[PDB]
Amino acid sequence: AMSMAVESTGNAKAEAESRAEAARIEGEGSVLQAKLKAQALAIETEAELE
Amino acid sequence: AMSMAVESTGNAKAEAESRAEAARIEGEGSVLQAKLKAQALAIETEAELE
Q: For A15-50, give one letter per residue: b (16+ CB within 10 A) or e.
A: ebbeebeebeeebeebbeebbeebeeeeeeeeeeee
Partner-chain contact A28 B36, CB within 8 Å:
yes
Q: How far is A44 from chain B (nearest CA, A)?
A: 12
CB A37 within 8 A of CB B44: yes
Give the gap in angstroms from C-alpha A13 to the nearest C-alpha of chain B.
6
**Method of structure determination:** X-ray
Closest residue in A to B17 (Cα–Cα): A9
Cβ atoms within 10 Å, residue B40: 20
In angstroms, rounded to a whole number, what is the distance separating the alpha carbons of residues B33 and A24? 7
